[PDB]
Design an enzyme around this catalytic site. Sequence first.
Site, short mmCIF file in Angstrom:
data_model
loop_
_atom_site.label_atom_id
_atom_site.label_comp_id
_atom_site.label_asym_id
_atom_site.label_seq_id
_atom_site.Cartn_x
_atom_site.Cartn_y
_atom_site.Cartn_z
N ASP A 129 29.43 29.66 35.78
CA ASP A 129 28.77 30.84 36.31
C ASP A 129 27.85 31.42 35.24
OD1 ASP A 129 28.23 33.00 38.09
OD2 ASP A 129 29.65 34.26 36.99
N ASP A 149 32.94 32.90 42.04
CA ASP A 149 33.39 31.67 41.40
C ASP A 149 34.78 31.24 41.85
OD1 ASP A 149 30.97 31.70 39.76
OD2 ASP A 149 31.93 33.41 38.74
N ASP A 184 33.43 33.96 36.15
CA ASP A 184 33.80 35.33 35.81
C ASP A 184 34.23 36.16 37.02
OD1 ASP A 184 30.89 35.22 36.58
OD2 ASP A 184 30.94 37.38 36.21
N1 LIG Z 1 26.37 45.62 44.15
C1 LIG Z 1 25.18 44.73 44.48
N2 LIG Z 1 24.43 45.45 45.32
C2 LIG Z 1 23.27 44.92 45.82
N3 LIG Z 1 22.88 43.66 45.45
C3 LIG Z 1 23.64 42.94 44.60
C4 LIG Z 1 24.79 43.47 44.11
N4 LIG Z 1 25.35 42.57 43.30
C5 LIG Z 1 24.56 41.48 43.29
N5 LIG Z 1 23.50 41.71 44.09
C6 LIG Z 1 22.39 40.81 44.37
O1 LIG Z 1 22.98 39.43 44.93
C7 LIG Z 1 22.25 38.48 44.47
C8 LIG Z 1 23.21 37.32 44.21
O2 LIG Z 1 24.49 37.89 43.98
P1 LIG Z 1 25.75 36.84 43.68
O3 LIG Z 1 27.03 37.58 43.77
O4 LIG Z 1 25.75 35.74 44.67
O5 LIG Z 1 25.54 36.21 42.19
P2 LIG Z 1 24.98 37.16 40.95
O6 LIG Z 1 23.61 37.67 41.23
O7 LIG Z 1 25.92 38.30 40.77
C9 LIG Z 1 24.79 36.19 39.39
P3 LIG Z 1 26.24 35.12 39.06
O8 LIG Z 1 26.47 34.19 40.26
O9 LIG Z 1 25.89 34.29 37.83
O10 LIG Z 1 27.46 35.96 38.79
C10 LIG Z 1 21.72 39.03 43.11
O11 LIG Z 1 20.46 38.59 42.87
C11 LIG Z 1 21.73 40.54 43.26
O12 LIG Z 1 20.30 41.01 43.39
MG LIG Z 2 29.39 36.35 37.44
#
Ligand SMILES: Nc1ncnc2c1ncn2[C@@H]1O[C@H](COP(=O)(O)OP(=O)(O)CP(=O)(O)O)[C@@H](O)[C@H]1O
Ligand SMILES: [Mg+2]
Length: 972
Positions: free
Chosen positions: A325, A678, A674
């Site tokens: 992740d 995941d 994390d």
């Molecule tokens: N509380 C929240 N509110 C609104 N949008 C959110 C959010 N948390 C994440 N997002 C949006 O969701 C999109 C993808 O979220 P996802 O949960 O799938 O992975 P992530 O963006 O958190 C990075 P990673 O997978 O490495 O942890 C992100 O680009 C973000 O803009």
């Molecule tokens: Mg993450």
Amino acid sequence: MENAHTKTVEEVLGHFGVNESTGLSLEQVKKLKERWGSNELPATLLELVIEQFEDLLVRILLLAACISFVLAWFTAFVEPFVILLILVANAIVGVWQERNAENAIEALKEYEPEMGKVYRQDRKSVQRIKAKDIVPGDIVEIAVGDKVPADIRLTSIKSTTLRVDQSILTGESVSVIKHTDPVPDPRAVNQDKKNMLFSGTNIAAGKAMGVVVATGVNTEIGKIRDEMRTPLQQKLDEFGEQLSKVISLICIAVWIINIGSWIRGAIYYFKIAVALAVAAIPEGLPAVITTCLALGTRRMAKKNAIVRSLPSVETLGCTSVICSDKTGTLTTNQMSVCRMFILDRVEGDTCSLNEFTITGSTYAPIGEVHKDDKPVNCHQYDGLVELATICALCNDSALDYNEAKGVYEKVGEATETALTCLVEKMNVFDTELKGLSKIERANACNSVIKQLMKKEFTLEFSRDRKSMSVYCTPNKPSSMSKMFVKGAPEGVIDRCTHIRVGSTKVPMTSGVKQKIMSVIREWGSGSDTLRCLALATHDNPLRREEMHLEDSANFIKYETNLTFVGCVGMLDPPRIEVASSVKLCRQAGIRVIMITGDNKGTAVAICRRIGIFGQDEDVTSKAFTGREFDELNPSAQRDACLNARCFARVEPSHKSKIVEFLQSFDEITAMTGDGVNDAPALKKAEIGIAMGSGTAVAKTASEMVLADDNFSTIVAAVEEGRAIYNNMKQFIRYLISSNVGEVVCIFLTAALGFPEALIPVQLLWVNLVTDGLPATALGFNPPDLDIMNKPPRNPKEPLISGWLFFRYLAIGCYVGAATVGAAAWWFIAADGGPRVSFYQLSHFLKEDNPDFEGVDCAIFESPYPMTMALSVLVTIEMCNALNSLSENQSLLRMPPWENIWLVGSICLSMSLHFLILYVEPLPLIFQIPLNVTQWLMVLKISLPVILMDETLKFVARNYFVLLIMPLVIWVY
Ligand SMILES: Nc1ncnc2c1ncn2[C@@H]1O[C@H](COP(=O)(O)OP(=O)(O)CP(=O)(O)O)[C@@H](O)[C@H]1O
Ligand SMILES: [Mg+2]
Ligand SMILES: [Ca+2]
Ligand SMILES: [Ca+2]
């Protein structure tokens, strides 16, 4: 308070006299801790001893200890006793090593107190306290990823829906859904308690708050605390079965060719085929594997890595793909908005922006907004008051000051928490912040916003819709409700049908839509690798009365015909030790894939940073979005996984499917995650790795938790996993290549018609000496010099090789032509003793015999050449053991002092072998006084097995002395 779920909400609130929105008073806690104790748990004596003998090899060799003792009343007990001393010796190492590691894992979990979010009366905001300071009374808050810290009755649910994983407590592998209405059934089971949470279980979706009703022992999980093979093992247990099948074969294949009272004397040779069985039987195979596996669990627990399933290390020696992740795991999750922009003016097709920079890399709410490296008052920017409005009213997060560490911490998700921090720095309403403390300033300006705008309900996050709505109404109506959104840029701008320019709205254009995605490409590909969010608001939302939130798939439909406001760009630094790992892995023969839901543009730019890619490397074939993958042809979609190193804009189903595709290619995958996204990929993969700072549901579902948050620990486990299987192979080579000799020393003796090779009491002594702690301690062997410079092991390929089989005869045959080559030297070519000829020696089986003229037939009843074969097999097997430090690395490259424990073992088994030949009562019990003229030959004979195995090493390899040489010069 018993059976709270019978009772309703206010009922349980009255029982403790707490306001739901205020929480438990300060001496109320003092009293209640004096009425229910802490919120913890106070954690056999000889059972570990008895568990050692539960294995087949020591179950059967427990018999031979009683069979040779059956004949006790008929030395007699010295045979069964020596079988005990090798079984007792190995059984003590394991219990020792096992208790070593046990304290370690229990030393690391204790390091980090499990916090928990309460609502006491000192701070007007939510705060993190130690789980054990929780008492039955205070309001508690939890959210997605949090373990529940205490038994709670639900009082209010903020999100649409709540999802708890009660597996550890109930076993149901599904997430149930809660409510706040009373369940009348006063004896209802935990599963039918749908308005309660229990410690140890996690939240899968949503966020809510309730009141504690039990702690410590009184919790369902505490109430039942006192009342509760591996992939390499099945490779060894398919082995342990097969050898005994051949052992008892060859053993009883000895017992027969000898018998040819003449039948009561056929029970002597029984104790031979029985003792010889114990001799060539690895008594310590099941002890030496429980040793090494316990050791690694202690090695890793040392490096701030709790190992939750023991075969984790073993399988990691074979990993060829380590997916990870991005956010939180490959980044520090230390987020702060440092770039943002709103729309300046839009005339026709073209348009301009009003960009900004914001200082402050910490979560601390100190910093200023710059326009062009110059500070500005945000109230003058009408679009900024709104971006600020969205960023604090779409937040499920909050800032919490930690007075212990004197630094600010997050309450909720890092991404959201960076926004709470930003709305503080803007202060779009120009409130006077001078007289407020380090705690009052964690959530100061949001309060003004939250005091002007009544947030009626939120439409929580959905990783497939990638956005989060919020419903709001002004506090002085007349009816003017609105809706605010924040979500993925690519996604939110899709649904945005309008853009706001200051305090006015205008229809969305092509050109405007262009500029935005370029800024965002600029932001994600830049030196900061920004993680960007779009922020828009719905001006004419659908009334709450006409809305349908039972089906969350409607959420995206309601977030439509939006007005775009602005974008934020927050920074996220890669973890420091991470660029080394991907350098170390590509050398160990391991591929590293990135799986992320963020922007492909940013996710690649990180990969360029940490070394998955390089700034000039063409990445057109190694990076695909979630869509770019499923919208492929199956052949190109196949060989993508073979070479792709980055997958972005990706849901947990994908990561679960991504790992899946890797495994369909006979690949051994590891998954580093994390957060909740995941969770499927963690379980799916062979082994999942979670971050200490991450969530509990990520930690629970994964099989090794880096409480360090160190990312190079992963490599160390792969060295442990590669080192454990390698210690076996040498241990394998030692006992196996050494007992082909003990069989030929017997079988060569029979074929040549020679005198007696050994006696059943001698047969089990040399077993004890060579196969006791000396053989056993081979597991502490030093990891090979080039262990992480070669590809990983393929588990489906067999344990032993045809070149290694050949190396077992070349040392088994030699130690046999050396065990019998020393006893024949005392009969044919010795100075002090008979000069019997070869012919005279093989037909020795009389005074009348003219072929036996001038020889006392009593010389064949002498213990002399017996301890010439006994102390040759002990010396030569200690020599062969000294060969068994590495498969191919010679003793010129791997000297024997590196393994301290085989040394301190061989010296103990020669101190116990030299104590037998010269003490007063033993040379009679053992049928055995050898000095310089004979001990030099046993040296002259036992030493070449050093070189003979060394020449095997030298040839396979191509396709100290101040101490060593004076010893050899005496010899020759
Ligand atoms: N509380 C929240 N509110 C609104 N949008 C959110 C959010 N948390 C994440 N997002 C949006 O969701 C999109 C993808 O979220 P996802 O949960 O799938 O992975 P992530 O963006 O958190 C990075 P990673 O997978 O490495 O942890 C992100 O680009 C973000 O803009
Ligand atoms: Mg993450
Ligand atoms: Ca043995
Ligand atoms: Ca042996």
